Amino acid sequence: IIVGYGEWPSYNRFYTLDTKLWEKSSKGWYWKFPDVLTETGVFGQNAQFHYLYRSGFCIHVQCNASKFHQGALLVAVLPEYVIGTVHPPYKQTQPGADGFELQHPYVLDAGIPISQLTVCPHQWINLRTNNCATIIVPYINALPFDSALNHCNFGLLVVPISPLDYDQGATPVIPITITLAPMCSEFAGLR
Amino acid sequence: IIVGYGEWPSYNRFYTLDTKLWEKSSKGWYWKFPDVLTETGVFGQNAQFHYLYRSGFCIHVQCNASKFHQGALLVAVLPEYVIGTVHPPYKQTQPGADGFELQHPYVLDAGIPISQLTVCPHQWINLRTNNCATIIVPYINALPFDSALNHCNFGLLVVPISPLDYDQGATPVIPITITLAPMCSEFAGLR
Amino acid sequence: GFPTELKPGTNQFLTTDDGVSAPILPNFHPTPCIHIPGEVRNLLELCQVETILEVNNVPTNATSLMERLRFPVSAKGELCAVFRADPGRNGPWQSTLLGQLCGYYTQWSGSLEVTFMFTGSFMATGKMLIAYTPPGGPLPKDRATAMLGTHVIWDFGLQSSVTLVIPWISNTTGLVSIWYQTNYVVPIGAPNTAYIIALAAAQKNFTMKLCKD
Amino acid sequence: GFPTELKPGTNQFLTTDDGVSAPILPNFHPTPCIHIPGEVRNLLELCQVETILEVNNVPTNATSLMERLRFPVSAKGELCAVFRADPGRNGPWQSTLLGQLCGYYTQWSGSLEVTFMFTGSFMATGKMLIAYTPPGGPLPKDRATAMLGTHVIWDFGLQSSVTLVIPWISNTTGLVSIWYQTNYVVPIGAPNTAYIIALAAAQKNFTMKLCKD
Amino acid sequence: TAETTLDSFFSRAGLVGEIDLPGYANWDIDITGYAQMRRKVELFTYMRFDAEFTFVACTPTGEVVPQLLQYMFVPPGAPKPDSRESLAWQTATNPSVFVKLSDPPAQVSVPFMSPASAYQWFYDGYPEYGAMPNNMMGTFSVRTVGTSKSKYPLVVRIYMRMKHVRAWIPRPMRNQNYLFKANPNYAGNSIKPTGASRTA
Amino acid sequence: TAETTLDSFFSRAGLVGEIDLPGYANWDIDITGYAQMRRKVELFTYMRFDAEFTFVACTPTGEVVPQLLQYMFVPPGAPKPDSRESLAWQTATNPSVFVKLSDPPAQVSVPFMSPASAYQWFYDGYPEYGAMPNNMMGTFSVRTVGTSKSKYPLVVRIYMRMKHVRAWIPRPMRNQNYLFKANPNYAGNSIKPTGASRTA
């Protein structure tokens, strides 16, 4: 496990999002947190009927690939990941539990280099080394509580650093599974 | 022995250079250190295949003269002995284990008087008193290590203060022998 | 009263002067600071994080800038890639955060640490030579003289990531070259080209001086 | 507030004032100083080193300036050389480092120490009289009155170097003359002319005052 | 190690904004006024610092004239002056400084103004997207004391230095050219590599 | 004995360089600017000292005018301004001082800048022969604050005093006339004795 910034979240089940099909032309995907869980589940039922909110997260990413596929994935959390357009639309700014595709993974839709993401809590998914990457992120904000609907704490970025390669005949799509479990969640202001 | 500046070199065999023939018209000779030992020997094999270097030296000067010859030699080490031309050529700036002849021994090819060299570590070679002069010089530099090929720590100056005199029939040339043994040598950066 | 005289250098404004000035709101209390996770106090902590080193900074095309993050290894004693151990000067080290922070300072000195990551099929095997040449030394003419210096023999059939530690740098610079010790051997059904990712960082003894914009 | 008044002499710039001024780089750390051998703290150490005294400052020719470092002794009660014990004034003492540093100061006082070195054949013998006359006294008319004062009888068949200590000088000056006590006797086959080298220095009690460019 | 501390990294007062009075002007406090300082502050996500401001006023030719000036600081939430005779100038709750151009430049200190616990440079949400609401430090208004028109043209330079800088959540440094002061968008067609290239 | 210490020998600030602005000028720091101080510093081989600089500005007639001036110190390795509107002037990492000509002369202190452990006046080697690379202290740039042309001609005098002087490796003092600021060559044909002569 990677404990983000060395702090365990302080003061509740696994959620499985849609699988993402990693291909030869894939550029990357990003999910906005906790907006990814607002629309779905009992957790998202509290988010839309409460004023304030605070919670950590336990993001777990898995890739199901054989021994004849190759590639590397960089999974990293970026607190306050603001999008920079070539204003963004709503669907691009806060995509639901379906992420969005990066059009410019080099600048990461924010004018910042992909090469320097390792300064953030991250793990490498190398298909010949491991298929799992789990990151424990605490609550990060300037205030103890914040609105879950109008503000995203961080954005989980999953970018193919090296393209997926395979021989013709093998499965051309590698599913990517993300399982996130809210940890030390709090709510207030029942509306 | 004269210990240069009162410090023994801190943290390895005798080398004999070509004899210099002291005559009635001789003006003086100077050797650049450690450039005098770079081209020759196992010591100079390390100098040309390493980046950094530090070492003291143990310079020993001898003159083979009879009792019917007269003259005096001033041997002295001058740290950072820069040449001043009437830019110097390479052969004049860094002469090998063959020294160079001073054209203007009064100013010492540097615009400084010969009369004041006694402020430096030195010894007198008086043919009627002694024939040996040994000087122990430590490492002198502003940095702990320095390049042996592009920088000379000091220059050993041997100048006839009083001309050699002899009767016709005696040997008109007095050989001068310099035997230098590196002491507390260090090397680094094997290239 | 108490007798004093104004020494030279009064009524001047030195933009680096750290003298305490009068508050504009004496009665104001700023909101007390809370514990935000991940507090940084020294930039050396941000210099000691591994970061992608664009060794393959050949392409400049807009739709293929992403190909610079890694350099290919595919199908004997040849040269794969070569780069300088120069964090601050122009080149591949511009991409890493250490090499970007070196542009904010004038002098730096210490030990680097450059790791490589192999991104080939699990059944792919082979060996590669990673040699470092001290400052002054030229690029080796072949693997025979490349092995004589400081080097590591990296086989990626067993270990997928190796670390090469640059002994010491300061602001001639060192060279790092990577050689094909053995050809690229792969089984039937596995991709015939692979990639290597270079992650560069600084050791604990790296320091900087003379901050400069 | 605290009541003070500006005393006369404010807003002036005295080029000798040693007041501490504001650093231009408060956050800069200069590189720590290492032990370089041969550190000098007081210029009196550089004044206490023996140095060649050009007693024979007769020639000025470009190709023969080197003949001034020593004066010849060759082939009875005659005068060899004479020079003043005046480190700072114009003359032979300009060559020594003591006499050059005396030009950077206005006042000096103490005891000198002038040694001579004989540079003849080992088989050459003879005697020479080195007399010092206190200030005011004229040059002696002959060796008979030269011996009556303070003197040393120097024979160089036994000892090749002698030291004459000037008692005290301050900024009339003393005189030092050298006389042929006996003729120059040499065997057959040895050179018939020799040279003497004068090395002058300052004792431990020499001091200077009033530094002046 | 003492060289690379946050305080040393963010010390060295830099020119933030220049004011021209050829009879008043408002200058909202913005650190980004210093041209090269935005890329330096964006390297973290949160900040908490106190600022020292210095006002060096002179004519366009740099010559010093005997004129009285008033710089007033309106804290966040206060209304701005709309003319040279607005009642906002005489308000006591907007601190002012009266200084002549002959006296040494005025030097005032402004503490941490944000209601939150840190200045945040990226808002990943709405209060209009990316509008960080509680990052407003205040405003500095400059006018010449007097009712009639001033006799000289004035140029006012502002130098700001942060003390007691604290930072959180480091992030990758900007590599593309900036386009707008508020949102971080770039030019997609004219996208450039992080550095220089080579041939092999 | 206390008179002949190194600090007393190298105290007494001397005029190093004069600057004329008849609208900016660069003056690379060089101790040799003081005419009689080169022969004094060459008597040792290594030095380590901190410098205090004083800037006394006035018109060519010595009269004091009400003008604002900026002297900025660029540390070694920084680029120099090329014109009166170059972006190097607003850089925060080049410390500046804003002073009027009426106020007492500016007095700033510059520490030991060399990356080595001492300032070395003779380099017996190549980094072009005899070019001591790491002896560069920095540079002082002077300009009148303002955008338009100044109304008065200015003369700026710089006085430098070393404090905390340390020396190493004494060597014989120069006796021949100096020819070039960097290398120690002399005039071989017009070679002269150390002092005066006599007839006997």
mmCIF file of N, CA and C in Angstrom, chain F residues 98-143:
data_model
loop_
_atom_site.group_PDB
_atom_site.id
_atom_site.type_symbol
_atom_site.label_atom_id
_atom_site.label_comp_id
_atom_site.label_asym_id
_atom_site.label_seq_id
_atom_site.Cartn_x
_atom_site.Cartn_y
_atom_site.Cartn_z
ATOM 1 N N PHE F 98 17.023 51.274 -3.769
ATOM 2 C CA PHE F 98 16.443 52.520 -4.259
ATOM 3 C C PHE F 98 16.797 53.601 -3.248
ATOM 4 N N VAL F 99 17.530 54.613 -3.698
ATOM 5 C CA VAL F 99 17.983 55.701 -2.843
ATOM 6 C C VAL F 99 17.901 56.999 -3.628
ATOM 7 N N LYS F 100 17.526 58.075 -2.946
ATOM 8 C CA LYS F 100 17.610 59.397 -3.542
ATOM 9 C C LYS F 100 19.016 59.956 -3.365
ATOM 10 N N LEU F 101 19.358 60.938 -4.197
ATOM 11 C CA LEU F 101 20.675 61.556 -4.088
ATOM 12 C C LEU F 101 20.782 62.433 -2.849
ATOM 13 N N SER F 102 19.647 62.816 -2.261
ATOM 14 C CA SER F 102 19.680 63.608 -1.038
ATOM 15 C C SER F 102 20.027 62.758 0.177
ATOM 16 N N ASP F 103 19.581 61.507 0.205
ATOM 17 C CA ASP F 103 19.847 60.639 1.335
ATOM 18 C C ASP F 103 21.328 60.276 1.386
ATOM 19 N N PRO F 104 21.833 59.903 2.560
ATOM 20 C CA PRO F 104 23.245 59.527 2.678
ATOM 21 C C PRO F 104 23.578 58.368 1.757
ATOM 22 N N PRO F 105 24.840 58.244 1.345
ATOM 23 C CA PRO F 105 25.194 57.246 0.329
ATOM 24 C C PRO F 105 24.814 55.833 0.746
ATOM 25 N N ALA F 106 24.347 55.057 -0.229
ATOM 26 C CA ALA F 106 23.965 53.676 0.023
ATOM 27 C C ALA F 106 25.182 52.855 0.423
ATOM 28 N N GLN F 107 24.985 51.938 1.364
ATOM 29 C CA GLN F 107 26.076 51.124 1.880
ATOM 30 C C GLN F 107 25.602 49.687 2.011
ATOM 31 N N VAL F 108 26.097 48.817 1.129
ATOM 32 C CA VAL F 108 25.689 47.421 1.072
ATOM 33 C C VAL F 108 26.914 46.538 1.258
ATOM 34 N N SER F 109 26.672 45.323 1.740
ATOM 35 C CA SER F 109 27.724 44.362 2.035
ATOM 36 C C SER F 109 27.559 43.138 1.146
ATOM 37 N N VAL F 110 28.656 42.676 0.566
ATOM 38 C CA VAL F 110 28.662 41.513 -0.319
ATOM 39 C C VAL F 110 29.587 40.457 0.279
ATOM 40 N N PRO F 111 29.109 39.247 0.532
ATOM 41 C CA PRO F 111 29.940 38.219 1.164
ATOM 42 C C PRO F 111 30.859 37.538 0.154
ATOM 43 N N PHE F 112 31.528 36.487 0.624
ATOM 44 C CA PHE F 112 32.472 35.710 -0.179
ATOM 45 C C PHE F 112 31.692 34.922 -1.231
ATOM 46 N N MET F 113 31.936 35.234 -2.507
ATOM 47 C CA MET F 113 31.126 34.695 -3.597
ATOM 48 C C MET F 113 31.752 33.477 -4.263
ATOM 49 N N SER F 114 33.064 33.314 -4.159
ATOM 50 C CA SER F 114 33.746 32.289 -4.933
ATOM 51 C C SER F 114 33.302 30.898 -4.487
ATOM 52 N N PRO F 115 33.059 29.976 -5.425
ATOM 53 C CA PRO F 115 32.761 28.591 -5.033
ATOM 54 C C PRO F 115 33.920 27.895 -4.349
ATOM 55 N N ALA F 116 35.149 28.357 -4.559
ATOM 56 C CA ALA F 116 36.315 27.769 -3.917
ATOM 57 C C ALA F 116 36.405 28.273 -2.480
ATOM 58 N N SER F 117 37.509 27.968 -1.810
ATOM 59 C CA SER F 117 37.715 28.399 -0.436
ATOM 60 C C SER F 117 38.549 29.668 -0.325
ATOM 61 N N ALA F 118 38.941 30.273 -1.443
ATOM 62 C CA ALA F 118 39.739 31.490 -1.406
ATOM 63 C C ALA F 118 39.771 32.118 -2.788
ATOM 64 N N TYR F 119 39.920 33.440 -2.812
ATOM 65 C CA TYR F 119 40.153 34.173 -4.050
ATOM 66 C C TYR F 119 41.617 34.020 -4.439
ATOM 67 N N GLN F 120 41.874 33.478 -5.620
ATOM 68 C CA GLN F 120 43.235 33.217 -6.059
ATOM 69 C C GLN F 120 43.578 34.145 -7.214
ATOM 70 N N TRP F 121 44.678 34.881 -7.070
ATOM 71 C CA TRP F 121 45.025 35.917 -8.034
ATOM 72 C C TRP F 121 45.890 35.412 -9.177
ATOM 73 N N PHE F 122 46.445 34.210 -9.059
ATOM 74 C CA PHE F 122 47.274 33.615 -10.096
ATOM 75 C C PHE F 122 46.805 32.194 -10.370
ATOM 76 N N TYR F 123 46.375 31.937 -11.602
ATOM 77 C CA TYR F 123 46.020 30.594 -12.037
ATOM 78 C C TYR F 123 47.110 30.093 -12.972
ATOM 79 N N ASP F 124 47.883 29.113 -12.508
ATOM 80 C CA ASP F 124 48.964 28.532 -13.301
ATOM 81 C C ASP F 124 48.434 27.372 -14.144
ATOM 82 N N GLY F 125 47.492 27.700 -15.016
ATOM 83 C CA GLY F 125 46.874 26.676 -15.826
ATOM 84 C C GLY F 125 45.778 27.260 -16.682
ATOM 85 N N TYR F 126 45.043 26.366 -17.325
ATOM 86 C CA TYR F 126 43.976 26.702 -18.247
ATOM 87 C C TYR F 126 42.637 26.256 -17.676
ATOM 88 N N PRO F 127 41.545 26.961 -18.006
ATOM 89 C CA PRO F 127 40.214 26.591 -17.513
ATOM 90 C C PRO F 127 39.710 25.276 -18.105
ATOM 91 N N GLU F 128 44.004 32.062 -23.206
ATOM 92 C CA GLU F 128 43.150 31.486 -22.174
ATOM 93 C C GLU F 128 43.974 31.056 -20.966
ATOM 94 N N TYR F 129 45.295 31.084 -21.117
ATOM 95 C CA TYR F 129 46.182 30.761 -20.010
ATOM 96 C C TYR F 129 46.089 31.823 -18.925
ATOM 97 N N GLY F 130 46.080 31.377 -17.671
ATOM 98 C CA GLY F 130 46.038 32.292 -16.552
ATOM 99 C C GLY F 130 44.685 32.895 -16.273
ATOM 100 N N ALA F 131 43.623 32.358 -16.864
ATOM 101 C CA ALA F 131 42.274 32.868 -16.651
ATOM 102 C C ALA F 131 41.702 32.207 -15.406
ATOM 103 N N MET F 132 41.822 32.886 -14.268
ATOM 104 C CA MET F 132 41.231 32.424 -13.020
ATOM 105 C C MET F 132 39.716 32.413 -13.168
ATOM 106 N N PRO F 133 39.091 31.241 -13.282
ATOM 107 C CA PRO F 133 37.649 31.203 -13.556
ATOM 108 C C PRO F 133 36.782 31.645 -12.386
ATOM 109 N N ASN F 134 36.987 31.056 -11.212
ATOM 110 C CA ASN F 134 36.121 31.317 -10.062
ATOM 111 C C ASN F 134 36.672 32.421 -9.161
ATOM 112 N N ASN F 135 36.932 33.585 -9.754
ATOM 113 C CA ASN F 135 37.278 34.798 -9.026
ATOM 114 C C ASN F 135 36.273 35.914 -9.248
ATOM 115 N N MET F 136 35.113 35.602 -9.814
ATOM 116 C CA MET F 136 34.173 36.628 -10.239
ATOM 117 C C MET F 136 33.223 36.905 -9.079
ATOM 118 N N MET F 137 33.205 38.151 -8.604
ATOM 119 C CA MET F 137 32.382 38.531 -7.463
ATOM 120 C C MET F 137 30.935 38.837 -7.818
ATOM 121 N N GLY F 138 30.667 39.274 -9.034
ATOM 122 C CA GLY F 138 29.342 39.691 -9.415
ATOM 123 C C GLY F 138 29.426 40.911 -10.297
ATOM 124 N N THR F 139 28.387 41.737 -10.238
ATOM 125 C CA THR F 139 28.324 42.920 -11.080
ATOM 126 C C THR F 139 27.354 43.897 -10.442
ATOM 127 N N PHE F 140 27.658 45.183 -10.546
ATOM 128 C CA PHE F 140 26.781 46.246 -10.082
ATOM 129 C C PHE F 140 26.284 47.005 -11.298
ATOM 130 N N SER F 141 24.968 47.122 -11.428
ATOM 131 C CA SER F 141 24.358 47.858 -12.522
ATOM 132 C C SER F 141 23.618 49.053 -11.946
ATOM 133 N N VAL F 142 23.786 50.209 -12.578
ATOM 134 C CA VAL F 142 23.232 51.464 -12.093
ATOM 135 C C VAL F 142 22.335 52.040 -13.174
ATOM 136 N N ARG F 143 21.136 52.462 -12.784
ATOM 137 C CA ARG F 143 20.233 53.142 -13.697
ATOM 138 C C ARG F 143 19.357 54.092 -12.899
#
